[PDB]
Amino acid sequence: TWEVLQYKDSGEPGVLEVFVTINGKVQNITFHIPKTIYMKFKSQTMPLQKIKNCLIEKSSASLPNNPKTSNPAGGQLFKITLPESVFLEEKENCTSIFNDENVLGVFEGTITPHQRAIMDLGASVTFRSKAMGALGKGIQQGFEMKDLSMAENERYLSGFSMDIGYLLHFPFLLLLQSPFITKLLGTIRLLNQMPIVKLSLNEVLLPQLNWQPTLLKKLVNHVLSSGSWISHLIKLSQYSNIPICNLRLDSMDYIIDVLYARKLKKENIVLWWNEKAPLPDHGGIQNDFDLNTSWIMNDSEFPKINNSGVYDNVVLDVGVDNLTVNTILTSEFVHDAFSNDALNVLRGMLKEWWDEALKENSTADLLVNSLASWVQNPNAKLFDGLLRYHVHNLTKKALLQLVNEFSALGSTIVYADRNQILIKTNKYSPENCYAYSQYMMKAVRTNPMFSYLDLNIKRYWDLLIWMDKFNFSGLACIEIEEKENQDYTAVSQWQLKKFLSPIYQPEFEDWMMIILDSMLKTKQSYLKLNSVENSLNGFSHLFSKPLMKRVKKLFKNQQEFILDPQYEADYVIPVLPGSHLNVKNPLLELVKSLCHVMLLSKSTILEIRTLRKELLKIFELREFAKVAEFKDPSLSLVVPDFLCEYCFFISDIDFCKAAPESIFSCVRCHKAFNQVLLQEHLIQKLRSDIESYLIQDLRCSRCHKVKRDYMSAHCPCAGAWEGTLPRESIVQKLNVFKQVAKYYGFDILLSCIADL
Template identity: 25%
Template sequence: MDAPVATIFKGARMTTTYVWEIVQIRPRRDPGKFTLWLSLEDRLVSVPLRIPREFYLNLKSPDTSLFDSSYDAESLVRTLPRNHPCRHLFRVTVPESEFLEMESHFAHLTNNPNVDGVYEMQIPHTMRAVLRLGTACTTTKENDISITRTQSIGLELNGLERAGPSLTKRAYLDGGRILKTLFLYHAINHGRHVLVLVLPSGKFQVHLASPAGSREPLRKMQEQYSALNSARKAAGIVSLYEYPEEIEAHFSYHKDEHKLMAALSAELGTLTDKNYSIVLSSSRDPEYFDLRVKNMYKFPVIPMLTDRAAHLVAVPLQWQSETVEKLMTQYLFFGSWLRVAVEQSTYFDVPVGNIGADAPLFFADIDFARRLWQNDSLLWWSPGLRPDLGGMEHDANAPSEDPNSSVDLANPGCYTNVCLAINVRNLALNSVLQSGIVNELEGTAGATAFDSTSHTLNDYTSGEARASATLGDSVLSPQTFGILKGMAKTWLLDKVRNPGGPSEHAVDHFWRWLSSPSAQMYDPSLQRFVQGLMKKTFIQMLAEFKRLGSQVVKADFGHIILVTSKPPGTASAYATYLLNAVNSHELFTHLELQPDRYYDFLLFMDSANLGGVVSEDPYSTSSNSGPCIAMSWNIESFFPPAVRTAFHQDLRRIIVELYTEHQTHADADRAPLRVIDNLTQDSSAVPQDEVQQKTNEAVTKYLETRLTRRLLGRVSKILASQKQAFTEEEMPAEWLCPLLPGSHRTMATPVIEYVKAMCACLTLIRTHSNEVGILRRNLLELVGVREFASEAQWSDPSARCRVPHVVCRTCTHVRDLDLCRDADLMERTSARSRPGATETKWNCPACNSAYDRRAIESTLIDNIRSLIAAHQAQDLKCTRCKQIRVDDMSPHCKCAGAWQLTVGRAEALRRIRVLTNVATFHGLPFLKEYAESTLARW
C-alpha cells in the first residue's frame, strides 16, 4: 500500500504515465480554446485545451507556394469520400486564432482554381478531440508535463494521445460511481420559467419566474416524490444515484429570466470547490446556460437527453401539478439514465459529457468515423443535410426519391384462410451482413457486389480492378462498405455476448442512422446502396414464404401480411414453423420476424382499408364469445356523418356473416379425429372440392337474397333522408362531407358514394363477381344512375401522401406513414404549447412514442424540391407512338407526332396541392409556406 503523500505533491506525481479520464471537453468563449474536464481519483480538474483548425486540400497539381510558412501543410495519401481520386493531398494544421486572423488568405486558398476539393472543414473542434482522445488520454512522450503545470499553461491537442487498453486499469469513471452530481431541471413556456437545482442531500432549490409576477409555489412535492420513488423501488430499477427518503424544498421568486439565472449563478458559486458535476435536464442546450449563468463554466455539464414535452410548463390551470410530476419523473429517472449513459460512453469511448442530442446516431457517427480514420479515409462529416464531399455536393441537386427503391405490395381480395401479420426488424443490418449471399443468389456479384478477389497494383493502374460498386445512381467504394460491414458485424457479435448492452441499442438503430439526414455521417449514396440490398433481400424472403406455401397479401419493409392454407386453430403452430424455416435460411439469419396478429377472415383493399375477424386465441379452433372484428376503412371517413355510421355497421355485418358462412360449412364437413389404419382412406372424410362447392353455394345464396334485400332497404332509407335534407334551406351538418387532407375530387351525393364504396368492397370477393355485379346494377338503378356512367365509376376519395421508412426514435419500429389515410395519424389532441389549440397526434404504434414531426416535415419539403427537379428534367414522349425522345434537337417524332411531357404539369400541381392540404390539417407551418409559395410562382 502506498504511503500517505502530502496534497502539495499529488500534482507532481500525475505525469505522463498516469491515465487521465475525460468527463467532458467543453468550448470556451475564445476561439480554439476549450476546457478539458478530467477525473483524477476523487477530484475533478479543469485543464485549458487548445485545438487547432485542421482540414485537407486536394490539389490538381503540386504547388506548395500556395501555403504560408506560418502553419503546417503536410503532403500525404488518403482515401477520399466516394473514392474520389486523391491527386496531391495536403493536410493543413493552423491555430484557430491564426485561422481567423488570416481569413482572407484561407478564403483565397480554398477557392484557388488548383484546389479540387476541401475536406473535413465542417468537423467541429470538440468532435475532432473526442474522436482522437475518447474517454481517457495521456500526454505524448514529447510533452512530459505534470497536471499542476497543465492547469496553468494548458495543453495542445497534438500533445495528447488516446490511452490504450493496457494503461486503463479500471472501468471508465469506475462505472460512474465516482461522479458526484447535481441535478438541474429547467422548464419553460410563454415566459414562465421553472428552474430547480437538487443537491445530493435532497434539497430542492426551486426558482420560479413569471411575466405576471405571481408567487405560486409548487405544491405536493413530497407526496408526488414518495409515490414515484416507491414505484421506482418496486420496479427494481438500478441507479447510480442514491435517492433520499425525504426531500426539502425552498422557493425563490423572480420577475424575469435574467434575475432567475443570476440567482442560480450565485447558488452555484457556493458549490464550486466540491467536485460536483451537473446533470442538466432541459430542452435548451448547455450553451444557453453558459451565456446566462456566470458560474456554469466551473462545472462539467452532462446534458440529459429527453423529450421536449418533459420540459414544457403546462397550461395555466394545471401548470403546478403537471410541472411537479414532470420534475419528479425526470429526477427519479436521471440516476438510471446516468448509469446507461456511462455504459454507452465506455463502449463507444466517448466522454459522458459530450454525448450528442440524439445518442444512437451520435455513437454510430463516432464509431464509423474512427474506423474510417483508422483505414486512412477522410470523413464526410457534415451538420447539414448533405455530406461534405469537398465541395462537389453542391454541384448537383439531391437525387429524388426512387419509387422502385422500396417495396410496397398489395393484393386486394377476400381471404377465408388464416392470415398472418408479421413485423420485420433488422432488415438493413441483415442485408449488409449477408450482401455477398444476396448477390450470389441473383447472379449479380460482378456488378453490385464487393468481391474478395485480391488485385495487384498493376490491376488498379490498368483499371481492371473496380474502384467502386454501383447500384442505381449510388456509388460506393469497396473500402467504405467493408468498414460499414465490419462495424455492423462487431455490434452484432457484442450484442450476442452482452444482451441488453450498448451494442444492442446500436444494432436496433442501424437503419435509422443510415437513413437519417440528421446523422453527421449521413450519405444518401450509402443509404440508397443499402436500401437496394434491402430490396433484394426482402424479395428473396417473400419468395421463400411463397415456396413454403404462403402468399403475400401486403408487404413493405416493416410489415407483412401472409395468407396461409391453414384453418383456424393451427395458425400459431404453422406460424412458428414458417418463421423458423425462414430464419434457418442463411440469407435471413439476422432477421427478426415477430407475429403481430392472426386473421381468421380478411377483407383487404389496401393498407388503409381492411377489415376482418381477428383470432384472439390462435390455439383455439372456435370462439365462445363471438368473433372479434377489426375495422379500418379510410374511405368511410369521407362520408357525411349521416351515412358514415350506416356504412360502417353494414360492412361490419357483412364481414361477420361471410365469416360465419365459411365457418359453418367448414365445421360441419370436418370429420372427427380418430385413429385409422395406415394406407387406408377415411371414407367419412368429405372431399375438399365438395366443401368448397357447398361454401360457394351458401355465399351465393347469401349475396342474392339476404344481403341484396338488406342493402336495397338501406339505400332506400338513405335516399329518402337525403331528399328530405336537400329540401332544407341550409344543408344539415350531418349531410356535409368533411374536408380531409386527402380530399382531391368532387364527391357525388352521399347515397351514390355509399353505393359505389360498398360495391367496391364487395368486389373484393372475386369468386362471386357475377352476383356482386348484379347487386351493383340494382343499387345504382335505385339511385337513378346508369351502370356504366362515369358517375358510377368508383375511385378512392383520398389521395396519398406517403412518407416511407419512418423509424421510431425510441423502439426503432419501421413504418410507412400515409398522412392522408392512416387513421391513427388523424386523431387530434390538445396542443401543449398553445392553450386552446389542437394538433394531430403522430405516435408510434409499437411504443406510443411521438414521431419527430420536424424531421417528417423536412422530408416533405424535400419531396417538393425533388418533384420540381424531376418535372423540369423529365423526358419528352410522342403524343402518337408514345416513344421517348432520344435526342435534344428533333422538333417532332419520326412518326410526325408532337412531343409532350411524360408527367403533365397538372399532376405535379395536384401533388403539391395535396401537400398543402396535409400541412394545413396537421399543422406544419414550414411545409405550408413552402408549398403555397411554390404554387404561387409556378
C-alpha cells in the first residue's frame, strides 16, 4: 500500500513522476502508462499489418450520439492499445493504420497518462508483483504498471504529521499561493522538483490610498488559515481518492469529472473526455458547423407566466429550491438527445450521493449542491451540450407539471420564475389559510414527481396589484400569528415612476398610497357587509373628486411655469437605459400611468374608463386618441443563467428594467459581481444574436412555408421570400446595447460595438 502525493508527468511520454510516501518517509518513484486509443475506421475487414507491437481487438463500446452522425452502417470499432513512445514514432511515417483511408475517427486521444493513472489506480496504489523479486529492479528503473496493478482501499489515507510552509505573491509539502502559478514555476526551475499544493487566490486590488493597513489585513488571514486549509483538503481527499496535491480546493467540477468518468469506465461507454477544450471530443466531427448544434447551444431562455391584475384574495409566495436535482432524480428516431445509458448512470450517481448526504455527509452534500453548477459549465471536462439541452428541456416540462399539479386544487398561478411561484387562493382572509397552505404543501410533496423539491412560503398577500416583477404594490405579512391582529406592511416597487418628471414622481407615489387605502377600505366594507369581484367595486368614488381638482390645478401651474427659464430644472424628462419613447407633455404621462394602474382590474372596466375620459377632458384630447394610449417606457435586455460563485444561485439579470444595486450584486447573498465577466457575457449575447440572424431561414409572404431550394426567385405560389427574423428587430437589439454600454461604464462592449 502506497500513499501517492503528487502525480506528475514529464517530457518522456508514458512517464509519471510520483512523490509517494512509504511507511518510512517521502520518496520518488516513476510509473509507466501505455496509451489506449479508440479507432472507428473502415466498414469491414482488418488491416492485417502486424508491423506494430500493439494489441488490437474488435469491441462493442457504446459511442456518443452526435446529431450529424446518424447513419448506422455497420460496427467495427477497435480497442487499440499501444505505448505512447512508439505512437510518437508512428506519427512520423506516412503509412500506418491510424492515418490511412476510410478512417472515421479517433475517440480518446486527448487523455494524458496522468489522468489515466489518477482514474485507474487512485491514491491507494499497491504492488502485487510476486514472480521474481524485482522490487529493486522496479525501483532502479521505471516500474511499468500495465502488467501489475491493484487499487487497495483508501478508507484512511494518512495520519498527518509533516511540516508545512508558505509562498505568496501580491502584485517538503510547500503550499503555493500565487496569482501566476506558471510564471513562478518557470522562473525558478528548482521549484519544479519540490512537491507543492497549489491553492490560488487571485486578483489583488488596492484602494490606492493608505494601502498598508489593507495589506496587513490581507496577510493576516492567509497567515492564520493554514489549519483550516489542510483540514478541508484532507476531508475532501479521504472521500475523493484523488491525491492531495493534484486536488485543489475551489476546484469542484474535477471531482465530478473523475467520479463520473470512472463509473462510466465501469461500463463499456466511451469517455468522450476532452482536456482544456470547451467542446467534447467526438472524433473530429465536432470541428464543423452544424445547424442542430447551433440551435441547441443557443437555446437558454426559460418560459414564464405573468398573469397580471389586481387580486382581492390571498396570494402565496413560495420558493421552489432543488428543481434541477429533482428533475434528474425523478427521470433512434430522436437525433438531438443524450445517451440514455449515461443518463441512467448519472441518475444512479445522484441517488447514491443524495442518500449518503442524508446520513450527515458534508462531501456528499457539497457534490449534490455543485452538480447543477457542473452541468452548465463548459470549462468542466466531460461537458456535453446535449446534456445541458436535455436537462433544460426536462426542467421546462417539470415546471409546467408542477403548475398543473397546483391547478388540481382551487388556486390560480400568477407567476413562475424557477425560484418564485405566486398562487391565488379561494379564501379571502390570510388568517383562514394556515391549514390550507399546509395541506397543499403536503399534497405537493406526496406526489412521487416532486418528492425532492424544497418549498417554503415567504410572504402572505392581502391585496396585490401585479403588472410584472419590477412593478407591483400591495399589503403583505411575513407570517400569520395567533390571537393578535396580523401586522401588515405596505410595499410599492414601481419602476414606471422613474420615467416621470421630478415634480410628478412624488405625486405618483402619493396617489398610489390613496388608491391602495381606498381599495383596502372598500374590501373591508364588502367583507363586513356579508363575474365581478365585488370586493373592489366602487373604490374609485372616494378619490375621484379630489383627483380631478388636483389635475386641474397641476395643469394650470404647468401652463404658467412651463416656459419659465428659472423653472427649467423641473419638467426635464430623464434619460435611462432602455428608454425609447420621445414624449412631449409631462402631466399627460403622469395621468396615463396613473390610469393604467387602475385599468388592471378586469372587474371595474367601465367605472375606470368613465373617469379616464373625464380626466382627459381637462386636456383637449379624445378618449381614443393614439397619443392617449399607454406603452411601456422601458425596453428589456435579459442575460440568462448567471452564476453566483459564493451562493450557487441561478439568476436571470435584465440590464434595463432592474434598478442598480441589483445589477452588480447577488440577490440571496449581497455579494458583489465581477464587472468584466458581465461585459464578456453581454458581448457573447451580441455575437450570438448576430450569428442567429445570419443563419436564419426564408419564408413565403403568403404561403407560410420554408424555402427548400438553393437557387430560386420566389415560391411556386406567386409571392416573395421574406425573413423569419426581420432586420428591424436586430437593429433595435443593437440599439439597446449601445445605451446599456453608456449608462454603466463598459469599455469592452463599447469597443466591440465600434469594431463592427
